[PDB]
Tab-separated table of C-alpha atoms in Angstrom:
chain	number	residue	atom	x	y	z
E	1	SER	CA	50.196	46.111	44.534
E	2	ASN	CA	52.089	45.639	47.393
E	3	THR	CA	56.215	46.314	47.800
E	4	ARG	CA	57.856	44.270	50.502
E	5	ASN	CA	59.797	46.310	53.224
E	6	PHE	CA	63.104	44.899	54.397
E	7	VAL	CA	65.963	45.915	57.152
E	8	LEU	CA	69.368	47.116	57.355
E	9	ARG	CA	72.063	45.252	59.251
E	10	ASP	CA	75.554	45.990	60.090
E	11	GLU	CA	78.571	44.738	60.629
E	12	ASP	CA	77.231	43.060	63.848
E	13	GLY	CA	73.676	41.413	62.297
E	14	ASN	CA	71.802	44.590	63.938
E	15	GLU	CA	69.162	46.740	62.398
E	16	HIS	CA	68.623	49.735	60.989
E	17	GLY	CA	65.825	51.485	59.652
E	18	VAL	CA	63.432	49.541	57.691
E	19	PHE	CA	63.839	49.627	53.494
E	20	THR	CA	61.272	47.858	50.984
E	21	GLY	CA	61.346	47.194	47.423
E	22	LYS	CA	59.227	44.987	44.942
E	23	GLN	CA	63.045	43.102	45.359
E	24	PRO	CA	66.255	43.507	47.299
E	25	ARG	CA	68.511	44.293	44.709
E	26	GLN	CA	66.242	47.551	45.445
E	27	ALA	CA	66.538	47.974	49.273
E	28	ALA	CA	70.129	46.845	47.825
E	29	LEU	CA	70.279	50.025	45.476
E	30	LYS	CA	69.285	52.319	48.334
E	31	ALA	CA	71.581	50.381	50.192
E	32	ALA	CA	73.894	51.970	47.468
E	33	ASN	CA	73.479	55.358	47.539
E	34	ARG	CA	73.750	54.996	51.416
E	35	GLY	CA	77.761	56.180	51.902
E	36	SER	CA	80.087	54.502	51.036
E	37	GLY	CA	78.979	53.553	47.820
E	38	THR	CA	82.567	52.880	45.672
E	39	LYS	CA	83.716	50.663	42.662
E	40	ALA	CA	87.028	49.763	44.485
E	41	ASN	CA	85.483	49.042	47.440
E	42	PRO	CA	81.886	48.875	47.509
E	43	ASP	CA	80.070	49.371	51.128
E	44	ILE	CA	78.724	46.334	52.335
E	45	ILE	CA	75.345	46.094	52.644
E	46	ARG	CA	73.117	43.171	54.152
E	47	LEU	CA	68.950	44.026	53.521
E	48	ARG	CA	66.444	41.327	55.314
E	49	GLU	CA	63.728	39.935	53.558
E	50	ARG	CA	60.607	41.938	56.450
E	51	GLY	CA	59.130	37.857	55.164
E	52	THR	CA	61.552	35.259	54.865
E	53	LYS	CA	65.098	34.204	56.770
E	54	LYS	CA	67.050	35.241	54.309
E	55	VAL	CA	69.673	37.460	54.555
E	56	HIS	CA	70.261	39.638	51.106
E	57	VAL	CA	73.929	40.766	51.243
E	58	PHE	CA	74.706	42.109	47.689
E	59	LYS	CA	78.280	44.898	47.975
E	60	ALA	CA	76.396	48.574	46.760
E	61	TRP	CA	78.587	51.190	44.951
E	62	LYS	CA	78.391	54.519	42.977
E	63	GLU	CA	79.691	55.791	40.633
E	64	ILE	CA	78.383	58.752	38.907
E	65	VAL	CA	79.611	57.566	34.378
E	66	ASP	CA	77.636	56.545	32.215
E	67	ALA	CA	78.595	58.703	28.829
E	68	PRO	CA	76.283	59.318	26.458
E	69	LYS	CA	75.739	56.785	23.399
E	70	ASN	CA	72.063	58.157	22.305
E	71	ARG	CA	71.358	60.200	25.947
E	72	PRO	CA	69.753	63.263	25.963
E	73	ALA	CA	71.435	66.387	25.964
E	74	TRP	CA	70.522	67.064	28.947
E	75	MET	CA	71.800	63.828	30.186
E	76	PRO	CA	76.208	64.543	30.458
E	77	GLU	CA	78.221	61.803	30.872
E	78	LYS	CA	77.760	60.836	33.905
E	79	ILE	CA	75.052	60.188	35.913
E	80	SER	CA	73.407	58.864	39.826
E	81	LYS	CA	74.472	55.859	39.987
E	82	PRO	CA	74.288	52.793	42.516
E	83	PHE	CA	75.029	49.695	41.689
E	84	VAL	CA	74.993	46.532	43.820
E	85	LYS	CA	75.564	43.123	43.148
E	86	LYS	CA	75.388	40.426	45.542
E	87	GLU	CA	78.175	37.998	46.861
E	88	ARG	CA	76.228	35.532	48.390
E	89	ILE	CA	73.638	35.261	50.482
E	90	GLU	CA	73.457	35.089	54.303
E	91	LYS	CA	71.108	33.401	57.227
E	92	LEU	CA	68.526	34.633	59.644
E	93	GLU	CA	67.987	32.119	62.876
């Protein structure tokens, strides 16, 4: 029933708002939606588990796309999508 909180690291390793997610890729998904989420150069985002000393580090972008195969009528040829993959993993102390 619990969802684990995360923290957003900056360019220096600094810290930001408390993110959450049942899995680090959620915190990351909500890190994609954050700003420079582009597939040309995803908004590099650093998550930090408030449990493990493992700085999860994904690259996070958005693509307003998803042209319909079997989609609903109201659902266009694209949609708001924050996409994140993890390129590696960083470490807390």
